[PDB]
Structure to design on (624 residues):
């Protein structure tokens, strides 16, 4: 395979997680 | 009963608890519903242990018979202590370091021990979650990467170690871990392991960024999904041929096993971990409830669900063990039939083989019992047994995704508890400026425990994890749990505690609670503590190694740990147990 499937899944999962963290950090700042 | 003065004007009064909740609306978190609190507690109790430890012990320690010691200790130590932990937390309105420090200033070591234990357990357990999510990432492909051996460079045949071993065993020891031959041989950091380690710590920060406030929404799926998936697996497993054969195997009674000091030690150390006691997240989670919540009915419901879940997951695991053994057995007999058919140019069926066969030919004798007795305990069951069984099922890559999201959810719910146990005590020590937001502290714990977990991404990193996993729990949890029950009965006073409970629940604990808090539970916690130093001398501290270049390579090879390992066992099992006396000697000679 041109790209390892595990890396592409890893890619998409890490993506969502960090976009999760960004928003949560900002929602809390708004709460302040 | 022990003379501790100044206890009032160090804890809130009962008169002042009706007014404390309309002012801790600010500056203290509060569950959104009771279900949320109930789930978070369930997720903490129900964990990976109920998958690759409890089902194994159930059979090894007398199938069906193990229920006797498990259920005895469950109602005589589990429920009794779980209640003591829910009540004291809801009454004192603080976490674990808060409660013990308030009961007596020298009891702070108890809180320190619980925090240290939580850290040590969470460090290796998230590493296991890192391995779970490695497999899940490789679970989106028609041919599961643990389905076939990699070809030799000449492609003449399969890789030697895979050839001598199994594609599954090869995928775990060589392509996941890249394991070493010893704990003294350590290499570099397996980069892919570190990526997954990053993923694990990051997934846990996002759920625990703002404490229970963020973990409440998470437990709605993290504590529910596993039950749905566990159910879907039960209907699938029972359908598979060979299941029921492995249920029968789990529940065959060997009473002689009950008459063993090693049976009750495991049954004893299993109840404490299954209930996540002496970790001091359950005390912190109970402190957020209203002062008048029924914590007697919550301890009975949690403990009922815990004892039903334990058996229910054992039925799911031994359905797979029985299908996987029924598959190998049929494969073996097929090979033996083929040998006779090919050698004697023979038709031959299991029904007519022995009769049919009756020197050059070799028949590999195989018994279902031997295949069933191939069930192991600890990761191996998931990374070897299940991963293998799933490749021989239709829609292989969908049963792999569902099995590794389930284990992910189990692990993650357990991590919510362990993290509650490390952060809360840090806020009560006031290590960081109180002005700092909660996110900062939780982010420095998640980053500091991530950097220590690089030891388990070394090539020897599975040998280190199998050592910590055998010492992180046990002694510390047993001693910590014995002193929490002692400190709540002989130092705070069981008479003030009954009055307090009458205050919130409206009535006093019955004779059952009185009998087990004072005489039974503690007494039952001393004979488990004496069993530990009775079995320890037989441990020999020997660890299994892979060592591909070893005679009978695929066969188990146990080697003694290096002498320096004793230092490690002293530090991970002793320091979290000697801070309870250690702080109490320091405080009694700082005053004098
Ligand atoms: C039932 O349990 C007993 C007790 O563990 C088993 O007998 C043990 O067998 C091992 C292996 O030979 C010995 O090392 C132990 O000393 C034995 N214990 C006793 C008390 O005799 C017995 O084999 C078990 N039976 C089955 C069918 O599993
Ligand atoms: C681990 O694998 C790498 C290549 O991925 C190799 O350099 C190293 O020798 C392996 N470790 C052991 C102990 O064989
Ligand atoms: Na869990």
């Amino acid at each position: 395979p041109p790209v390892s499937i595990w890396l592409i899944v890893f890619g998409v999962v890490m993506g969502v997680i960090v976009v999760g963290i960004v928003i949560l950090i900002f929602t809390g700042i708004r709460d302040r | 009963v022990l003379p501790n003065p100044g206890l009032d004007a160090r804890i809130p009064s009962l008169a002042e608890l009706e007014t404390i909740e309309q002012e801790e609306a600010s500056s203290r978190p509060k569950w959104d519903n009771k279900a949320q609190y109930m789930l978070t507690c369930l997720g903490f109790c129900v964990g990976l242990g109920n998958v690759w430890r409890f089902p194994y012990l159930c059979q090894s320690h007398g199938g069906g018979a193990f229920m006797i010691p498990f259920l005895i200790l469950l109602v005589l130590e589990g429920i009794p202590l779980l209640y003591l932990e829910f009540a004291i937390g809801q009454r004192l309105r603080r976490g674990s370091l808060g409660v013990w420090s308030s009961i007596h200033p020298a009891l702070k070591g108890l809180g320190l021990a619980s925090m240290l234990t939580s850290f040590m357990v969470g460090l290796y357990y998230n590493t296991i979650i890192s391995w779970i999510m490695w497999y899940l990432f490789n679970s989106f492909q028609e041919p599961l990467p643990w389905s076939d051996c990699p070809l030799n460079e000449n492609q003449t045949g399969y890789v030697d170690e895979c050839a001598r071993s199994s594609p599954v065993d090869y995928f775990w020891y060589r392509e996941t871990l890249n394991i070493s031959t010893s704990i003294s041989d350590s290499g570099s950091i397996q980069w892919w392991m570190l990526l997954c380690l990053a993923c694990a710590w990051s997934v846990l920060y996002m759920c625990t960024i703002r404490g229970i406030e963020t973990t409440g929404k998470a437990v709605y799926i993290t504590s529910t999904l596993p039950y749905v998936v566990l159910t879907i697996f039960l209907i699938r497993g029972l359908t598979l041929k060979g299941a029921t054969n492995g249920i029968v195997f789990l529940f065959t009674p060997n009473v002689t096993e009950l008459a063993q000091p090693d049976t009750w030690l495991d049954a004893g150390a299993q109840v404490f971990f299954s209930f996540s006691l002496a970790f001091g997240g359950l005390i912190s989670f109970s402190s957020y409830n209203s002062v008048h919540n029924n914590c007697e009915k919550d301890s009975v419901i949690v403990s009922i669900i815990n004892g039903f879940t334990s058996v229910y997951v054992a039925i799911v695991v031994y359905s797979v063990i029985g299908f996987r053994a029924t598959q190998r057995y049929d494969d073996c007999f097929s090979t033996n039939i083929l040998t006779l058919i090919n050698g004697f140019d023979l038709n031959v069926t299991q029904e007519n083989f022995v009769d049919m066969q009756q020197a050059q030919l070799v028949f590999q004798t195989c018994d279902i019992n031997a295949f069933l007795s191939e069930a192991v305990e600890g990761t191996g069951l998931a990374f070897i047994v299940f991963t293998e069984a799933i490749t021989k099922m239709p829609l292989s890559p969908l049963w792999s995704v569902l099995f590794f999201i389930m284990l992910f959810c189990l692990g993650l719910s357990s991590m919510f508890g362990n993290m509650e146990g490390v952060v809360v005590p840090l806020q009560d020590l006031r290590v960081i400026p109180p002005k700092w937001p909660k996110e900062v502290l939780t982010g420095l714990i998640c980053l500091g425990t991530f950097l220590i977990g690089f030891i388990f991404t070394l090539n020897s990193g599975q040998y280190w994890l199998s050592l910590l996993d055998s010492y992180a729990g046990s002694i510390p949890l047993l001693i910590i749990a014995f002193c929490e029950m002692f400190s709540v009965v002989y130092v705070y006073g069981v008479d003030r505690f009954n009055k307090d409970i009458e205050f919130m629940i409206g009535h006093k604990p019955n004779i059952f609670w009185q009998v087990t808090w004072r005489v039974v539970s503690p007494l039952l916690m001393l004979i488990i503590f004496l069993f530990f130093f009775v079995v320890e001398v037989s441990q020999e501290l020997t660890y299994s190694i892979w060592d591909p270049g070893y005679e009978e390579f695929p066969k188990s090879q146990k080697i003694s740990y290096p002498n320096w390992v004793y230092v490690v066992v002293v530090i991970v099992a002793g320091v979290p147990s000697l801070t309870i006396p250690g702080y109490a000697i320091y405080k009694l000679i700082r005053n004098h």
Remarks:
- Chain A touches chain B through 15 residues (CB under 8 Å).
- Residues B 254, 256-257, 260 surround ligand 1 (CB under 6 Å).
